[PDB]
Amino acid sequence: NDCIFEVKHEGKVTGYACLVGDKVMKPAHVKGTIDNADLAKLAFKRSSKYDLECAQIPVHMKSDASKFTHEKPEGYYNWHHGAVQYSGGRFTIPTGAGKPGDSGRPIFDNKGRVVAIVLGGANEGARTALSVVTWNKDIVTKITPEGAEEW
Amino acid sequence: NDCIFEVKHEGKVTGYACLVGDKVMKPAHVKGTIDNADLAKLAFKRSSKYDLECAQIPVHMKSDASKFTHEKPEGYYNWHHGAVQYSGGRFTIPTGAGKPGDSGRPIFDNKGRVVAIVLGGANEGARTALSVVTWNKDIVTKITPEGAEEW
Amino acid sequence: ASHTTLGVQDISATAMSWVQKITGGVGLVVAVAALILIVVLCVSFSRH
Amino acid sequence: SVASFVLLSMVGVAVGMCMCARRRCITPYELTPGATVPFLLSLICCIRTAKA
Amino acid sequence: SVASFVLLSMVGVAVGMCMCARRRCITPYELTPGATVPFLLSLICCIRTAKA
């Protein structure tokens, strides 16, 4: 908890950055500066392949990074604005729960561990598909529902 | 079980279309155009060896798709016209538990997931063996009991 | 003429390997395409 | 004129056979939920993946 | 003068391709939280071991 930092544009809030494990991650589609000067001055590696900008956490002064896991069992997860249903290879939320500007928020399991980062979603009718970034035991991978857009 | 996916494709409907997973499914031996427009305009791929036609489900109605699994433990399964006994790897129903024109109906497990779709069956005394479309891991297969007729 | 006629398709000049190369090239494309279809049909046949 | 026709006809047949094979070995993947086509097959048959 | 220019240009291109390949190959490991770069991969990519 309380591991979320704001990313701000010149005239508005644009997205969020999160401290997970040993690295700090933000969506590459979010254009702005991190509110925390300690992270704002930190260099990031940009990869358009996964829509990520990542950097190492100054753990010597930032020991409050969240716990994380590569495990993705079926069930419900906590994504701040409510519960998210996970089944198969997709995360699903209520249609009125999602919004633009919410990108960068992590999804937590029942142990408080981060499993994925939210980039956006797609309207599937009664439910909205959630577009997220997750990882396996070795490397990071991205999940992109059809018709999904950045938030 | 408590949900209806069985869309009529003709006025004098013979069999029904349904939404399973991410694909629209109907028997390949039944003529007519699927109603409700959104499915009517879909192109379908036909395979004469499976008696099955399939098309991609439109994103906006994807949330209404039925749950799907390849798991097929021995036991009882449900459908809109009664129960189904699964024994020896084969699905069987009581004679008179269904008629021609009732095809295209999914068979559901105890979690409400689709395991098979009915095409027809063979009437042997008090019990009828069903001809069904079913799935294994990453493959579609068909079961056709001897003497089975199309429904 | 002191000789007889040249009237057969068989008596085309040498350096006609161009004909054999083109014919062989097209025949090879057919032979390969035929094999691809045969293998797929065999796999499809075995699957039920 | 005849040689050109025959050679072109043979090519057209070879292409038709390849296209038939392309459909026959893929259709079962489209029929199966999830369209879980393996990577190597997608390269061979020039087809798109489930998430395309 | 021209031969020297062209040969030097070819070398510069070969290097640029290698650097592009190196970045793309390693990104998935450096971009991933909690991940550790394989020893052999670090030797191939000519990079520092693990995270230090």
Ligand SMILES: CC(C)CCC[C@@H](C)[C@H]1CC[C@H]2[C@@H]3CC=C4C[C@@H](O)CC[C@]4(C)[C@H]3CC[C@]12C
């Ligand atoms: C590059 C390739 C296509 C060259 C092919 C040359 C061929 C098409 C030409 C060159 C010499 C020609 C042959 C010359 C002699 C005869 C005998 C005549 O009674 C019938 C036609 C026939 C048989 C001609 C057929 C066409 C021919 C074989």
